[PDB]
Write an enzyme that holds these catalytic residues in place. Structure first.
Site, PDB file in Angstrom:
ATOM      1  N   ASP A 184       0.849  -1.101  -0.101  1.00 54.74           N
ATOM      2  CA  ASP A 184      -0.018  -0.185   0.019  1.00 54.74           C
ATOM      3  C   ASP A 184       0.792   1.183  -0.039  1.00 54.74           C
ATOM      4  O   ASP A 184       1.203   1.664   0.951  1.00 54.74           O
ATOM      5  CB  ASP A 184      -1.090   0.108   1.346  1.00 54.74           C
ATOM      6  CG  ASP A 184      -1.891   1.181   1.142  1.00 54.74           C
ATOM      7  OD1 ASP A 184      -1.705   2.079   0.398  1.00 54.74           O
ATOM      8  OD2 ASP A 184      -2.558   1.385   2.527  1.00 54.74           O
ATOM      9  N   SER A 232      -1.097  15.855 -11.693  1.00 57.07           N
ATOM     10  CA  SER A 232      -1.490  15.658 -13.088  1.00 57.07           C
ATOM     11  C   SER A 232      -1.717  16.833 -13.707  1.00 57.07           C
ATOM     12  O   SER A 232      -2.369  17.632 -13.415  1.00 57.07           O
ATOM     13  CB  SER A 232      -2.823  14.290 -13.155  1.00 57.07           C
ATOM     14  OG  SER A 232      -2.972  14.250 -14.431  1.00 57.07           O
TER      15      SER A 232
HETATM   16  C1  LIG Z   1     -10.520  -4.238   3.870  1.00 55.84           C
HETATM   17  C2  LIG Z   1      -9.432  -3.162   3.304  1.00 55.84           C
HETATM   18  C3  LIG Z   1      -9.980  -1.852   3.477  1.00 55.84           C
HETATM   19  C4  LIG Z   1      -8.907  -0.959   3.313  1.00 55.84           C
HETATM   20  C5  LIG Z   1      -7.532  -1.106   2.691  1.00 55.84           C
HETATM   21  C6  LIG Z   1      -6.640  -0.214   2.261  1.00 55.84           C
HETATM   22  N1  LIG Z   1      -5.381  -0.506   1.986  1.00 55.84           N
HETATM   23  O1  LIG Z   1      -4.645   0.752   1.473  1.00 55.84           O
HETATM   24  C7  LIG Z   1      -5.920   1.537   1.339  1.00 55.84           C
HETATM   25  C8  LIG Z   1      -5.669   2.938   0.844  1.00 55.84           C
HETATM   26  C9  LIG Z   1      -6.780   4.142   1.456  1.00 55.84           C
HETATM   27  C10 LIG Z   1      -5.850   4.746   2.496  1.00 55.84           C
HETATM   28  O2  LIG Z   1      -5.588   4.173   3.649  1.00 55.84           O
HETATM   29  C11 LIG Z   1      -4.521   4.884   1.783  1.00 55.84           C
HETATM   30  N2  LIG Z   1      -4.288   3.436   1.187  1.00 55.84           N
HETATM   31  N3  LIG Z   1      -7.114   1.164   1.803  1.00 55.84           N
HETATM   32  C12 LIG Z   1      -7.101  -2.628   2.694  1.00 55.84           C
HETATM   33  C13 LIG Z   1      -8.113  -3.596   2.898  1.00 55.84           C
HETATM   34  F1  LIG Z   1      -7.864  -4.768   2.914  1.00 55.84           F
END
Ligand SMILES: Cc1ccc(-c2noc([C@H]3C[C@@H](O)CN3)n2)cc1F
Length: 330
Positions: A35, A199
């Protein structure tokens, strides 16, 4: 050093991507959601409330001879969709695709929200935003990339996400065979801890390009593309029968529609998202109404170049002293 790991869609819609990660000694392999929008490495564990685990692979620190409890350290995070998790912290050896970091903070979940429990394919998250966002208290911890980057051949990682197909995260090198044309680099602001960039504009289908500044983040952890309401309205106006639905929570469209492409600007370069990347399927099983992959950022406060956009590109996360972002077509 370098590392290279395959990343895989968790389902037929590319709702998210998981990447295998080796933790501890001997290795415990967990499939993590890489992420670039957050900065915590956290995992389902032997400490996670039993009722909140449903199919996930867990990290058991007691079985790792290199795991050490980080005394007094806790973590707690909430993501953009309302999901959350929390727990304590260990340090342990972590490897991604042959690249190894010793003493990495591994945040062991005691609690996770229902969304995490319900996704059996995601064993945790590996944050790749800037370490200023890390939630470990009372002593903030560094990300995997931050810990590795001095050892890397080049202080970079790349995201090459596939459309309905596997892809690759590379650390420390740029695979010049993974893209076409050139990589266009663009300035990054780290002031909010994100890979934040601007962008230069957009086009819808074969329409004329609109030059306009769109500040947003490159976020592999977000599924969809979130853009200003004006832009999103311009896109869905080109889809017969598409409408913004209150009950559903965004734009939906007739599943029989042919979706136009969406182009975004990176400096003078252009990244084209094919129309079918924007199809996220029936809103409920058997429905002929489909969920759109481009949605308004109005309720968010920031624009988000999530997987829908990033998977149309080869993306370089350049962690030099002054970080930058690179985009190439592929
Ligand atoms: C159930 C679930 C929910 C959310 C996330 C999730 N992972 O990255 C993010 C985005 C949004 C912000 O946090 C910055 N990165 N959201 C993963 C999940 F598996």
């Amino acid at each position: 050093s370098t590392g290279s790991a395959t990343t895989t869609p968790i389902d037929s819609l590319d709702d998210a991507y998981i990447t295998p990660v080796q933790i501890g000694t001997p290795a415990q392999t967990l499939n993590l959601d890489f992420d670039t929008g957050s900065s915590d490495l956290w995992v389902f564990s032997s400490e996670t409330t039993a009722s909140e685990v449903d199919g996930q692979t867990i990290y058991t620190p007691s079985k790792s001879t290199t795991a050490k409890l980080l005394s007094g350290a806790t973590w707690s995070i909430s993501y953009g969709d309302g999901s959350s998790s929390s727990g304590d912290v260990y340090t342990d050896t972590v490897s991604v695709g042959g690249l190894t970091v010793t003493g990495q903070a591994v945040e062991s979940a005691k609690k996770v929200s229902s969304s995490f429990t319900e996704d059996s394919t995601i064993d945790g998250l590996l944050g790749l935003a800037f370490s200023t966002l890390n939630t470990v208290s009372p002593t903030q911890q560094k990300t995997f990339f931050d810990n590795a980057k001095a050892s890397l051949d080049s202080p970079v990682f790349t995201a090459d996400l596939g459309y309905h197909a596997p892809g690759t995260y590379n650390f420390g090198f740029i695979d010049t065979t993974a893209y076409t044309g050139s990589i266009t680099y663009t300035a990054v602001s780290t002031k909010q801890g994100f890979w934040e960039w601007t962008s230069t504009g957009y086009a819808v289908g074969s329409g004329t390009f609109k030059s306009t500044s769109i500040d947003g983040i490159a976020d592999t952890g977000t599924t969809l593309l979130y853009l200003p309401a004006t832009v999103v309205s311009a896109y869905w106006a080109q889809v017969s029968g598409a409408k913004s639905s209150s009950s559903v929570g965004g734009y939906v469209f007739p599943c029989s529609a042919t979706l136009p492409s969406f182009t975004f600007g990176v400096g003078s370069a252009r990244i084209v998202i094919p129309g079918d990347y924007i199809d996220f399927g029936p809103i409920s099983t058997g429905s002929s109404s489909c969920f759109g992959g481009i949605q308004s950022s109005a309720g968010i406060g920031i624009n988000i170049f999530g997987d829908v956009a990033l998977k149309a590109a080869f993306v370089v996360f350049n962690g030099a002293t002054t970080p930058t972002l690179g985009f190439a077509s592929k």
